[PDB]
Amino acid sequence: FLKPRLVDIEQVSSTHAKVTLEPLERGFGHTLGNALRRILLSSMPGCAVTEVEIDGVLHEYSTKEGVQEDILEILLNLKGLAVRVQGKDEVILTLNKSGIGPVTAADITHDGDVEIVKPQHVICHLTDENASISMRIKVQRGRGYVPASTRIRPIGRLLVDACYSPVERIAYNVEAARVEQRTDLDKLVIEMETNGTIDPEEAIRRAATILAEQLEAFVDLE
Amino acid sequence: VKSDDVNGRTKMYKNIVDGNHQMEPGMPESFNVLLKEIRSLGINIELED
């Protein structure tokens, strides 16, 4: 049995990448592709936002004066914010902005361990230059989808839904690969669509590590 | 036991929590209400033995 090795991590965009596997025996390509796709779409580490506090507002059904968008819409916009923390599993982000103009994610005060993948993301629009907005964004590390109802104190804190999942679209194809003279060798290429927080090769490595760890359940160590 | 027998209701509830599953039939209160209603029209209803 030939051992698959990762040869290309070719990226066509910041959020789109294709990872190819050159050597594969017949029948192994589809098995590995399906298992990898399921284990990537299922469980990957993410860094979605969990909490948000705004000084003016009390409950997320209110409206802030001077802000174009509703507070619920602001929370929904924040839910899609993609951010990666490379040093901590918890961080507090502060956003301060004043004057007329859209409030983009680039306006968030940033630390060394926190970076924004797409600064062009917009949070809310300020229509009156007198009005100002301030937030305390709380970011946690997790996996899967954790609804805001299943958390298990102050009035000011606003709870948002948490969906820690860097990947959102995985597709794979099995193609014939020519190695030396023998045929039946298959090449598996996996096309990924992340939000930019998780590297492709690291994602494949983590997914395969989880798959190998789970295989030890019904087999002795090998 | 589940609808009208108030004595039956309380006895069944007390029996269930004690591990017993007996049942005292008794008489529904709706039947007694009907008996009084018919007696109120000058018609004699009696559960003769």
């Binding site: 589809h30 098995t31 592709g33 399906n34 796709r37 399921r38 | -």
Partner: protein, 49 residues
């Protein structure tokens, strides 16, 4: 006109695509209709029932 509009995009004219099973990973036979449908949520909730 619908077929012409589909041909305007890069879609099959028949309107059916070959779908792959999510868990098994093996493609379904008999190409299956796929499209975008406007769906409503009715007021007959379940926590109220």
């Amino acid at each position: 006109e619908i077929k012409e509009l589909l041909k305007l995009g890069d879609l099959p004219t028949s309107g059916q695509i070959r779908l792959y099973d999510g868990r098994t990973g093996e493609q379904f036979e008999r190409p299956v209709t796929v499209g975008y449908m406007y769906m409503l949520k009715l007021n007959h909730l379940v926590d109220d029932k």
